[PDB]
UniProtKB/Swiss-Prot annotation, chains A, B:
Effect ascribed to mutating residue 67 to A: Abolishes interaction with PAK1
Induction record: Up-regulated by ATMIN, PAK1 and estrogen.
GO molecular function: deoxyribonuclease inhibitor activity; dynein intermediate chain binding; enzyme binding; enzyme inhibitor activity; identical protein binding; nitric-oxide synthase inhibitor activity; protein-containing complex binding; scaffold protein binding
Family of this protein: Belongs to the dynein light chain family.
Gene label: DYNLL1
Protein's organism: Homo sapiens (Human)
SUPFAM superfamilies: DLC
Protein name: Dynein light chain 1, cytoplasmic
CDD domains: DLC-like_DYNLL1_DYNLL2
Pfam families recorded: Dynein_light
UniProtKB/Swiss-Prot annotation, chains C, D:
Protein's name in the database: Dynein light chain Tctex-type 1
One Pfam short name: Tctex-1
Gene: DYNLT1
Matching Gene3D superfamilies: Tctex-1
Subunit organization: Homodimer. The cytoplasmic dynein 1 complex consists of two catalytic heavy chains (HCs) and a number of non-catalytic subunits presented by intermediate chains (ICs), light intermediate chains (LICs) and light chains (LCs); the composition seems to vary in respect to the IC, LIC and LC composition. The heavy chain homodimer serves as a scaffold for the probable homodimeric assembly of the respective non-catalytic subunits. The ICs and LICs bind directly to the HC dimer and the LCs assemble on the IC dimer. DYNLT1 and DYNLT3 compete for association with dynein IC (DYNC1I1 or DYNC1I2). (Microbial infection) Interacts with human papillomavirus 16 L2 protein; this interaction is essential for virus intracellular transport during entry.
Originating organism: Homo sapiens
Upper lineage: Eukaryota, Metazoa, Chordata, Craniata, Vertebrata
Gene Ontology molecular function, alphabetical: dynein intermediate chain binding; identical protein binding
Swiss-Prot record, chain E:
Annotated S-S bridges: none
Purpose of the protein: Cytoplasmic dynein 1 acts as a motor for the intracellular retrograde motility of vesicles and organelles along microtubules. Dynein has ATPase activity; the force-producing power stroke is thought to occur on release of ADP. Plays a role in mitotic spindle assembly and metaphase plate congression.
Swiss-Prot/TrEMBL domain comment: Dynein heavy chains probably consist of an N-terminal stem (which binds cargo and interacts with other dynein components), and the head or motor domain. The motor contains six tandemly-linked AAA domains in the head, which form a ring. A stalk-like structure (formed by two of the coiled coil domains) protrudes between AAA 4 and AAA 5 and terminates in a microtubule-binding site. A seventh domain may also contribute to this ring; it is not clear whether the N-terminus or the C-terminus forms this extra domain.
Organism of origin: Homo sapiens (Human)
Name the record gives this protein: Cytoplasmic dynein 1 heavy chain 1
Family from the record: Belongs to the dynein heavy chain family.
Full protein: residues contained: 1163 to 1307 of 4646
Record text on subunit structure and interactions: Homodimer. The cytoplasmic dynein 1 complex consists of two catalytic heavy chains (HCs) and a number of non-catalytic subunits presented by intermediate chains (ICs), light intermediate chains (LICs) and light chains (LCs); the composition seems to vary in respect to the IC, LIC and LC composition. The heavy chain homodimer serves as a scaffold for the probable homodimeric assembly of the respective non-catalytic subunits. The ICs and LICs bind directly to the HC dimer and dynein LCs assemble on the IC dimer. Interacts with DYNC1LI1; DYNC1LI1 and DYNC1LI2 bind mutually exclusive to DYNC1H1.
Modified-residue entries (Phosphoserine), positions: 68
Amino acid sequence: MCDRKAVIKNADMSEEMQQDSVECATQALEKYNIEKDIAAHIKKEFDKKYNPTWHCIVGRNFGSYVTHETKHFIYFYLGQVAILLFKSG
Amino acid sequence: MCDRKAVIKNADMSEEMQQDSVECATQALEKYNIEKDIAAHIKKEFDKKYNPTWHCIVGRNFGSYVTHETKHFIYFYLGQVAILLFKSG
Amino acid sequence: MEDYQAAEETAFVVDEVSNIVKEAIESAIGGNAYQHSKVNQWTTNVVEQTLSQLTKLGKPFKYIVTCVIMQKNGAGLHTASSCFWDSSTDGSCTVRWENKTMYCIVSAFGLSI
Amino acid sequence: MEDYQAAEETAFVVDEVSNIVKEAIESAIGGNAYQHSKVNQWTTNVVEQTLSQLTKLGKPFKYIVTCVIMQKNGAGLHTASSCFWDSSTDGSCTVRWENKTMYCIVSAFGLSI
Amino acid sequence: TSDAVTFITYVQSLKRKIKQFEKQVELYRNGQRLLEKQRFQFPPSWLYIDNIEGEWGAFNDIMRRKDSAIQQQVANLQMKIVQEDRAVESRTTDLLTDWEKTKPVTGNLRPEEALQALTIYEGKFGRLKDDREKCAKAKEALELT
């Protein structure tokens, strides 16, 4: 297992869901190679788990400014991949 | 005005709405040098004009998979800059 | 011919009530979106233009007009109004307008004096 | 003393109409939860019950009853009405009710014939 | 609003603490920096720094956006408290007149029945005292009137 340490760069969250995000994003990165598809996989899996709807981006060079639901916003780094995921809707 | 041709990849929203996005995005790119500030500009002015809640992503490479309400989705290129703007809230 | 003209003058025409309500609503709100703090002012406007322009008609009618404004967030819409008057001289007109995020229904009742 | 009793009988008394609206809402709605299908039935029963009770009063008033029933989803609700009549005789009564999941605003207007 | 203005007082009591916590965060935001240049292995359930800093900035902004705003519109509350204390003074004068009228100091009245009457008077007098003291405490807590 490639130990890609997670550095979560912002979160209005509980910790358990943040670590779920880290683990499943690591799983998606291990499973797929397309940033759009990584975000897609993570978005469906949280939509299934903690009820819709989120918005997930996976990439290297991107900047974001959105409005999210309270206690439902995370943004972290795995390896060289920044992953944002916020619930709004 | 540097005629950065807005080659528009994905669009579920009207053409005047497309052109408003393109004009004020040229505005945001020509006014700001940080993609985060560009996205904040565009989301804020769409929140002012087309009501909350907007979500703007400005970047050079990224993978996005989000759920948007109908008639409220754009994903285009200004130069090499990819801009994804969608409403969800 | 004169009797018909007098009856039309003293009648409650539904079409002009719909037009007057639409004009009042459009002047008061127009392209503005839904704002909870401004619903009070929007309703007050709609009703005051409606009542003023209905009084400007000069018809011998007591006017009762009600305005309801709604956020679009999936909530249901309905307006039910059953009344008891003389149908030959008193009338009612309900106008529903909607925009991207807001519903506005105004019901105007004109009763003979 | 007789004149006061006659005036009370012939006047649009607000609290009686308010209690009529409460009885109509409680009978038609009660504690049942909001359902899109039953909204029309609830509104029709409320309005007809209010109209029947107002007519049973025997007062020479034309009665106008409007009912709004609302799903609770965080949307603000405001109903406004500014009207012209002879304030000495005609009256109005707007009453608001609510439960865990529903609002209900009923407006009853009585106009002297 | 009393309870509300109580919480209003509460939020003022938090303001200093906010600054306090803020500077702690400042101290913290220095120490954690050492953490990465001392090569720390950050645990998974460790909530990372930028998370808390973003949400705390959001906290402070929302508080100072809305609490202050709701604080300025207190004139309606001010007049409500004014009329409430005016009614309290009116009821106090009415109770004064009732006490002057009600004096059972004469020995002809039955001690038990006059005792029950004085007990009803003392119950409503305690209610009046509670009303007066709660109006005074609301006035001094709001402290703008």
